Chains A and B, each alone.
Chain A
Amino acid sequence: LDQIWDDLRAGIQQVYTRQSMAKSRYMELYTHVYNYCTSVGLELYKRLKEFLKNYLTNLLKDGEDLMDESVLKFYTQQWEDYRFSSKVLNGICAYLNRHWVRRECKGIYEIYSLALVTWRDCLFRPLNKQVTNAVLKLIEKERNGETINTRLISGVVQSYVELGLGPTLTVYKESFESQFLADTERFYTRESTEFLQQNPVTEYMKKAEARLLEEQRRVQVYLHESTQDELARKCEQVLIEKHLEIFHTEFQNLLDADKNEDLGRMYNLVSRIQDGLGELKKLLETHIHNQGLAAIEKCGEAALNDPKMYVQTVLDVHKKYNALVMSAFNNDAGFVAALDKACGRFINNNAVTKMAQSSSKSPELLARYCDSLLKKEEAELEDTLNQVMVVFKYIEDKDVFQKFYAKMLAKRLVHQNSASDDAEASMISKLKQACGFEYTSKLQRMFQDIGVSKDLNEQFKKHLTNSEPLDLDFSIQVLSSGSWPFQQSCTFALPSELERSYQRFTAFYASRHSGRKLTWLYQLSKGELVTNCFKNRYTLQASTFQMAILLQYNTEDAYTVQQLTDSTQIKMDILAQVLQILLKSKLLVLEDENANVDEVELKPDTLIKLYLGYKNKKLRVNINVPMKTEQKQEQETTHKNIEEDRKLLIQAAIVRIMKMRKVLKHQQLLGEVLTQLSSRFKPRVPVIKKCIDILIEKEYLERVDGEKDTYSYLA
């Protein structure tokens, strides 16, 4: 019992210094525990327990006064050793572990657990209030840029973990982690509030990103996995979210000034706080919105009559913040939403719509712009075209865009300044997809006729070859009255030099289509005139009307405004406007010389005389140009027209709806009406009411007696 306790202790002591052992000697000690056990299983124990307590206690003297990277170098170098030595002791003490108690009935032995336990009674000595501080100081060092030996920290923590009763973390937390994080909260709390007071936010953002990253390796490399998602939470907590109103106010400037790579960063940073990315979206919507209203504001009046300016301004706005939402805000749907909402808001209600007193001005402009683009290069057009379809998406009064687009496309197919039939087609393809089909088809019918009219002409061209030619080069366009916006008009005495082309064709068309009949549109038909009476002789493009007049100057030379309004039988209200062009052009002069003609009160009395001589330096002058008020008159008119169709469209809906419900309640119906009409426009409620009314008068609906605000369909 003591005959062994001595040599066994000899070995124990050798095993605890680090003197290599002999395979035989390891076993000798094993043997001693074997015999001491297979003879007391608490005597050998306590004696081992003593040897340990009276080993560590002594060791402590070697560090009691060590203090910085030294208790660290000390405590760790001592731990690594004590561990292995005990692993070996635990090895010899097999029989003390196993018979003397319970086995076979996990890396927990008691003899080793006996070693761990006594040492933690070495941990309370230096560590708790020291070896831990030395660590926090060293970590602080590395955080201030000081390259450090991380193994002085690893060793410590790994110890703590194991000195627990991997799963047990009390000691770790209680004697280190808790203080670690606390120190971290303050360290970063202090670094941030000081950097911000001394640096531009764009720079604090760069740093915070960095620190966060640094603190990552600072756990993966020398801390326990346990403290991972907490050091992270805490760091973001102090590095990112107590600085959100600072981040917020700056979010602005980072937009007020197009410095958008930082926006990406702020994004990636707030993208770390729960719901933190919310207020960013709000601020953006508001921003891009005001940003849009401003753009338009600064275009003043021009914008009101410059479609390119207008559409290009909106386009510029959107195109900026889109590619901005793509990179910077990682194409986040939540953000795409802000942009959309903002664009939808300003595109429909802005400075132009305001002064025009109607949101419908935007859609018309968009439509006009399209027209400009399709009149007489590729990348821009197909793209520009494509951008147009983007804007459209946001327009709410879409029927308006549609009416104008057709109204203007039509004035094109006929007369002039249409680009390649390609863009034209390509733009149809684009509408086929956004716009409906009833719409797309309506347009198709227009193209059909033009083609049909084309072939029709090639027929007549022959009919003339096959007989008596005409006194001029004639061509016509027969358009189905129903499919075109055109309206015949201004009464008109047709000059003689044409009458042959007229009858000659009329007869022909009548021979081609028996059941049909033609109604000629002079306000929309032109021709080429030749001048064999001036210094130089030229060909001038001229509206029929203009020709109807000029041709009169083939007899006398002056004609009172009345002498004309009588002859050509072309209307004064309008006949006057034409003359003004003819004057400003310079083929007519009133009487006097000074030309304040641009703004005169040409009364019936006033004379209009042919001017002989001088003329355009060129040989082909196009005297046919828009009467000024002409456009403003067509515009206001097509709107007026849209006002009508709207009510008619509304009722159509009211009906088919009440026709497939037999009874509905006021609201019920209004909701329906909207749902359908939504893709085209937003029927003002008072109007659907004034509509449901007229249907009651037209006897398509009747109120449900014994139930006001409920309607029944009257078959």
Chain B
Amino acid sequence: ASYHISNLLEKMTSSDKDFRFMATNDLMTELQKDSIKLDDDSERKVVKMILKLLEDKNGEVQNLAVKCLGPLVSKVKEYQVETIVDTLCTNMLSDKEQLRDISSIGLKTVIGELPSALAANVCKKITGRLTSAIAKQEDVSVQLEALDIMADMLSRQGGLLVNFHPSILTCLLPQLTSPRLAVRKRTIIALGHLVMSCFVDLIEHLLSELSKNDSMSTTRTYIQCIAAISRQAGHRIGEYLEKIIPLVVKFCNVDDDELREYCIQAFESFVRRCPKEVYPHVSTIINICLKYLTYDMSWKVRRAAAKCLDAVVSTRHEMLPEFYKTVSPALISRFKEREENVKADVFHAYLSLLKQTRPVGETPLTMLQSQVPNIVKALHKQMKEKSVKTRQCCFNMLTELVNVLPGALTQHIPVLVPGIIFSLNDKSSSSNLKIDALSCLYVILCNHSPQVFHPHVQALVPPVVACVGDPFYKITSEALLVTQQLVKVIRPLDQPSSFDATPYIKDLFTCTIKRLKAADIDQEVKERAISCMGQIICNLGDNLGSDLPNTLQIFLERLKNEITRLTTVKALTLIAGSPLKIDLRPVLGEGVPILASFLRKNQRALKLGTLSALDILIKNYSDSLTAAMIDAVLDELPPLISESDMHVSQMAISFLTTLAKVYPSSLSKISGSILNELIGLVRSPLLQGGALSAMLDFFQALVVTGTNNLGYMDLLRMLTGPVYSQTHKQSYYSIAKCVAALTRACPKEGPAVVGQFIQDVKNSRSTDSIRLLALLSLGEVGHHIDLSGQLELKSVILEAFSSPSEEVKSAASYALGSISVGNLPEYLPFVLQEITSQPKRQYLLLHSLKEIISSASVVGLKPYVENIWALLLKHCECAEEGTRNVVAECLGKLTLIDPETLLPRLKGYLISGSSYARSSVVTAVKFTISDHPQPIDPLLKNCIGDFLKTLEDPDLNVRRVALVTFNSAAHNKPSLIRDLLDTVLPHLYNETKVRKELIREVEMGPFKHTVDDGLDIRKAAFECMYTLLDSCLDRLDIFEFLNHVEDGLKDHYDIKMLTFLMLVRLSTLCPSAVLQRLDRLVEPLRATCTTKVKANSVKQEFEKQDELKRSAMRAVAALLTIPEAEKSPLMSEFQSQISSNPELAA
């Protein structure tokens, strides 16, 4: 307020602690809200007062005062803030004491509460005060506290003081010598935080200072300090090590017990400084000083070694072999027991190794096997150790171990079990142990032929069955998880066994109902219980006491929670379709409808599983199905048949396909929404695979049923209806697929099929749309059934080849091509035949043939292969340059069929042959590169170059086709490029250049038109580079790339938009080689945003530059979003015109 601050300052010298306290409280509430009422006087008083109170005879008040500073600083003119600090930094040396301490705290507070323009001098002034302070001034106390502040500030506000650093360092370094060691520590902390801001000029004075003072003077301190910077810097010390590494070692020999620090060094050194390979020199030493015990003080040594070996192993993966083959398996396991803390670090190290091995001459895993029995022999002695901590390591070991090698422990289950069991008992309030053991056991039983455990069942159950009935739940859940697997171990239903499990059923089943029948224990336990019981039912059930019906009932019941409910569904889907045809008859009755009930909880999971269950049931419990159950589901379906959730859609379509598969009769109800909803799903652009396959299998099993108003002809009209009355390309494709389905189902054909030509020929006014669905139907149907009948069609199909519409023309190409498969000998020859006969249809016919080769049959094709191939090696009549592609795409598809005896053939037209032969072949091989790894890949990886690193420099468009083939490979399978980069790249870049000879002018008055035949090949060159960018990028000489990128910024507009973006890519990706050439990349970028156009230009002419200009900034922009070390070159000429650019680009 106003009079407030006045009244407060009085109450602030109120002699009564309470008032001075409340006055200072009420004063601080104020100094927080809007920094108002600041008299440039009221401040003077206030501050002076606060600083006064900083020395109040009562702690409670003093405290408030210091807590007042914070909000103060940020609420008063810059000189008053100057005052504070100064006044605080001065009391620092006060001859009172409590003043030095509270003044000290005060300082820290201000510091913390800050930032931007403010914090300027606010640390700056300070920095100077601490400096003289930090000077060895024969008062530690002062130093020690200044050093803290120096550290607390240097880091929370390191971004600045840049010009103070050299001045800071110069007062620190000498302290690394302080007779009080605590000062040495405090100082190192400072150095550490110091380098976070550097600058690039200071990381070296510091290091050198350290490398220099490596003059044998006592106190291995400069040691720690090196390690210290390593953790903080790391990167910044990666270009300073050749001298480092050796110096360290040379000293490491020195038999002292603080030698651990050097390891600490090597560790910290080799955990952050990656590209610094002195790996071996290190491993060797560690392993040698890793067993440094004698007979005290040593051990911290062993620790460091252990810790280091741990580091190494956790990043150098490329060293697996070396690891498993030089002391670590052999000499970690060796020292797999010792003191305690150290023992622990040894294990941890190994784990890292196991984890490293974890991938996804003579392999890692194979080297691992070789290790056990050694691993096992070791653990075996450990596993029986009093330490709870140790045994836990044994289990987490075997676990991870077995998780790496799913079969790892086969030859040893017997020396482990005692180990496992042993720990399943007690040394307590360590529930971790019991749980960790319980997990290990679970993992084991999950990846090992069950037979192996049989002899051990007899003595493994009691301890498990007991853990289940343990007080703590966490233990009970695992116990139940093991029990469930333990069951599958003695119930083998997949691979028949001969182990009598009967003598364990009771006990197992017991502990479980005890949990499943509760409702007081954690839900986790309630689910692992239903899960388990479910398995207990699915697998022994059969000799399961008569306590089963009672239990099945239990499930039914449990199924009415929002917890229990989903887990039981699945557990019930598992009890169904289980070898031992288990009876679920009772529970169906009120449960089935309780299931449908779920179908309305819009809960993805539940829908999916509930449906997945209503299916098994119906499938294996048909008779017991009451018509009053089925339609109790049917009703909840329509919303499930939406194009919004295909999976759910197809899941539910499977259910109907089942209902009609084993319960026809109910069909009646399949007409309401249901039917008039699948039919809708058919007309969807989103319908594909999964659901479509089910949509087809459904219809095919609905007609066979024979049903009033749901027959063959009935349904065709339903599908092909909406079309025959006046939307999306996919629609027709799905429709024809069903039509065909419903056709191959009821082969009463000719009516429909013939009734599908006088549908095309029926041109005489026939919606261009019908002709489409018509042709597509003749296609799908023709693929399966033999239309070798009506020959009236061979022509009708071709007539459409001359349609004014692509949509129909293609549809015709497909139809013929596909129909060709229904009867391959009666059609294929015809096709090849017409291909040479009427060439006016070459394109489409060659596509029809593509369909044949593509997806035909594979046995029915081999015959004609030698034929096709002959036709395709002749059709390099370059007639249409679009045609040579279908061919190439055909040669390519063809190759795939027995590539071993076809690729070589192509790897030979190579030499001799013509521009087009050369092209076609290197284009056909392109249409061989698949997205997913294929059989050809191996062989392809080999012959590839003979087309590439050979086709890069021959002649003409052939080179272009080459580039494209290289672009096509490196985009979706560089696994065939890697080796070839070294050879290829040069060329790739060579094609990036301009061939002035490929450019002609076209003058006409003032107007000139430039034709550049090189523009396209060249455009393909840069487009190859952009692709190397996403993948193969390390194998790339980063600068050759940028050399050439520079070349294409100044190229052609169409080529600029690419490189501009390539820059923005390289901005994020690899920045360092950018900045280095950041000045060379800007001249161009500038040129653009400068270039003008004569108003003698047409409107669009301009827009082009407007768009090209702002497309360059976009780059120039991101060229500034690279560590503001880019401001250094030369750069943002604020311009009135240019302004509007980074403006509208932002």
Direct contact of A and B (CB under 8 A): yes
Q: Using a CB–CB distance below 8 Å, which chain A residues touch chain B?
A: 15, 18, 20-21, 23, 26-27, 30, 64-65, 67-70, 73, 84, 87-88, 90-92, 106-109, 112, 130, 133-134, 145-147, 149-151, 154, 161-162, 166-167, 186, 189-190, 193-194, 197, 210, 213, 216-217, 220-221, 225, 245-246, 249, 294, 297-304, 377-379, 382, 422, 425-426, 429, 432-433, 436-438, 440-442, 444, 655-657, 659-660, 676
Query: Contact: A433 with B59, CB < 8 Å?
Result: no
List the A residue with the shortest CB-CB distance to B182: A422
Query: Contact: B25 with A676, CB < 8 Å?
Result: yes
Shortest distance from the beta carbon of B1045 to any chain A beta carbon, whole Å: 15
Q: Does B830 contact A (CB under 8 A)?
A: no
Contacts of A438 in B (CB 8 A): 59-60, 62-63
List the B residue with the shortest CB-CB distance to A297: B474
Contacts of B605 in A (CB 8 A): 249
In angstroms, Cα B809 to Cα A133, docked, is: 14
Contacts of A245 in B (CB 8 A): 604
In angstroms, Cα B431 to Cα A303, docked, is: 11
Shortest distance from the beta carbon of A179 to any chain B beta carbon, whole Å: 11
Q: Does B639 contact A (CB under 8 A)?
A: no
Shortest distance from the beta carbon of A609 to any chain B beta carbon, whole Å: 35
Q: Using a CB–CB distance below 8 Å, which chain B residues touch chain A?
A: 11, 16-19, 21-23, 25-26, 59-60, 62-63, 66, 98, 101-102, 104-105, 108, 148, 181-182, 185, 264, 300, 428-432, 435, 472, 474, 604-605, 646-647, 685-686, 688-690, 802, 804, 806, 809, 843, 880, 882, 885, 926, 931, 964, 967-968, 971-972, 1001-1007, 1009, 1016, 1019, 1023, 1026, 1030, 1054, 1057-1058, 1060-1061, 1095, 1097-1104, 1106-1107, 1110-1111
Query: Contact: B1002 with A166, CB < 8 Å?
Result: no
Contacts of B1023 in A (CB 8 A): 147, 150
Shortest distance from the beta carbon of B883 to any chain A beta carbon, whole Å: 10
Shortest distance from the beta carbon of A625 to any chain B beta carbon, whole Å: 22
List the B residue with the shortest CB-CB distance to A303: B429
List the A residue with the shortest CB-CB distance to B685: A186
28 cross-chain CB contacts under 8 A: A20-B1001, A20-B1002, A26-B1005, A27-B1005, A64-B804, A68-B882, A69-B882, A70-B882, A145-B931, A147-B967, A147-B968, A151-B1016, A151-B1019, A166-B1104, A166-B1106, A193-B646, A194-B689, A197-B647, A220-B1058, A299-B429, A299-B431, A302-B430, A382-B185, A426-B182, A437-B59, A437-B66, A656-B18, A656-B22
| Contact of A217 with B1061 at beta-carbon distance under 8 Å, contacts A298-B432, A441-B98 already known | yes
In angstroms, Cα B22 to Cα A698, docked, is: 22
List the B residue with the shortest CB-CB distance to A435: B63
Contacts of B17 in A (CB 8 A): 656
In angstroms, Cα B18 to Cα A676, docked, is: 13
In angstroms, Cα B474 to Cα A294, docked, is: 9
List the B residue with the shortest CB-CB distance to A108: B1099
Contacts of B690 in A (CB 8 A): 194, 197
In angstroms, Cα B19 to Cα A656, docked, is: 7
Residue of B18, B885, B1030 near A655 (CB, 8 A) is B18
Query: Contact: A107 with B1057, CB < 8 Å?
Result: no
Which 4 A-B pairs give the minimum distances between C-beta atoms? A26-B1005, A166-B1103, A301-B429, A438-B59
Contacts of B182 in A (CB 8 A): 422, 425-426
Shortest distance from the beta carbon of B116 to any chain A beta carbon, whole Å: 18
Contacts of A145 in B (CB 8 A): 931, 968, 971-972
Shortest distance from the beta carbon of B771 to any chain A beta carbon, whole Å: 16
Shortest distance from the beta carbon of A348 to any chain B beta carbon, whole Å: 21
List the B residue with the shortest CB-CB distance to A23: B1005
Q: Tell which of A70, A249, A304 has the most Cβ of chain B within 10 Å.
A: A70
| Contact of A221 with B1057 at beta-carbon distance under 8 Å, contacts A107-B1100, A422-B182 already known | yes
Shortest distance from the beta carbon of B192 to any chain A beta carbon, whole Å: 12
| Contact of A167 with B1103 at beta-carbon distance under 8 Å, contacts A300-B428, A433-B108 already known | yes
Shortest distance from the beta carbon of A546 to any chain B beta carbon, whole Å: 31
Query: Contact: A659 with B22, CB < 8 Å?
Result: yes
Interchain Cβ contacts within 8 Å, total number:
201
Shortest distance from the beta carbon of A603 to any chain B beta carbon, whole Å: 34
List the B residue with the shortest CB-CB distance to A18: B1002
In angstroms, Cα B886 to Cα A69, docked, is: 12
> Apart from A88-B1004, A162-B1100, A441-B62, what 11 extra A-B contacts exist at CB < 8 Å?
A23-B1005, A26-B1005, A65-B802, A107-B1098, A150-B1019, A190-B686, A197-B646, A249-B604, A299-B432, A302-B430, A422-B185
Query: Contact: A106 with B1099, CB < 8 Å?
Result: yes
In angstroms, Cα B1016 to Cα A90, docked, is: 29
Residue of A216, A225, A436 near B1061 (CB, 8 A) is A216
In angstroms, Cα B1107 to Cα A197, docked, is: 41
In angstroms, Cα B182 to Cα A437, docked, is: 24
Shortest distance from the beta carbon of B197 to any chain A beta carbon, whole Å: 19
Query: Contact: B11 with A660, CB < 8 Å?
Result: yes
Shortest distance from the beta carbon of B1116 to any chain A beta carbon, whole Å: 15
Query: Contact: A194 with B880, CB < 8 Å?
Result: no
Query: Contact: A298 with B474, CB < 8 Å?
Result: yes
Query: Contact: A437 with B688, CB < 8 Å?
Result: no
Query: Contact: B1003 with A21, CB < 8 Å?
Result: yes
Query: Contact: A20 with B1003, CB < 8 Å?
Result: yes
Query: Contact: B806 with A444, CB < 8 Å?
Result: no
Query: Contact: A107 with B1005, CB < 8 Å?
Result: no
Contacts of A193 in B (CB 8 A): 646-647, 686
In angstroms, Cα B102 to Cα A179, docked, is: 72
Query: Contact: A437 with B1005, CB < 8 Å?
Result: no
Residue of B21, B105, B148, B1095 near A656 (CB, 8 A) is B21
Residue of A15, A225, A433, A436 near B1107 (CB, 8 A) is A225
Query: Contact: B1009 with A84, CB < 8 Å?
Result: yes
Shortest distance from the beta carbon of A506 to any chain B beta carbon, whole Å: 30
In angstroms, Cα B1007 to Cα A20, docked, is: 10
Contacts of A220 in B (CB 8 A): 1057-1058, 1060-1061, 1111
In angstroms, Cα B604 to Cα A147, docked, is: 38
Shortest distance from the beta carbon of B764 to any chain A beta carbon, whole Å: 22
Query: Contact: B806 with A130, CB < 8 Å?
Result: yes
In angstroms, Cα B1110 to Cα A106, docked, is: 20
In angstroms, Cα B182 to Cα A294, docked, is: 39
In angstroms, Cα B931 to Cα A186, docked, is: 21
Q: Tell which of B809, B1060, B1100 has the most Cβ of chain A within 10 Å.
A: B1100
Shortest distance from the beta carbon of B792 to any chain A beta carbon, whole Å: 25
Query: Contact: A660 with B1005, CB < 8 Å?
Result: no
List the A residue with the shortest CB-CB distance to B17: A656
List the B residue with the shortest CB-CB distance to A300: B429
Query: Contact: A67 with B809, CB < 8 Å?
Result: yes
Query: Contact: A109 with B25, CB < 8 Å?
Result: no
Shortest distance from the beta carbon of B881 to any chain A beta carbon, whole Å: 8
Contacts of A161 in B (CB 8 A): 1100, 1103
Query: Contact: A300 with B472, CB < 8 Å?
Result: yes
In angstroms, Cα B884 to Cα A69, docked, is: 12
Shortest distance from the beta carbon of A233 to any chain B beta carbon, whole Å: 18
In angstroms, Cα B1054 to Cα A197, docked, is: 39
In angstroms, Cα B627 to Cα A162, docked, is: 66
Contacts of A189 in B (CB 8 A): 686
List the A residue with the shortest CB-CB distance to B65: A437
Residue of B435, B688, B802 near A190 (CB, 8 A) is B688
Contacts of B885 in A (CB 8 A): 69
Query: Contact: B1100 with A149, CB < 8 Å?
Result: no
In angstroms, Cα B806 to Cα A150, docked, is: 21
Contacts of B428 in A (CB 8 A): 300-302
In angstroms, Cα B493 to Cα A346, docked, is: 45
In angstroms, Cα B1006 to Cα A380, docked, is: 81
Residue of A88, A107, A303, A657 near B1099 (CB, 8 A) is A107
Query: Contact: B1101 with A660, CB < 8 Å?
Result: no
List the B residue with the shortest CB-CB distance to A30: B1005
Q: Tell which of A300, A433, A440 has the most Cβ of chain B within 10 Å.
A: A300
Shortest distance from the beta carbon of B460 to any chain A beta carbon, whole Å: 23
In angstroms, Cα B1003 to Cα A27, docked, is: 13
In angstroms, Cα B102 to Cα A399, docked, is: 21
Residue of A26, A162, A217 near B1026 (CB, 8 A) is A217
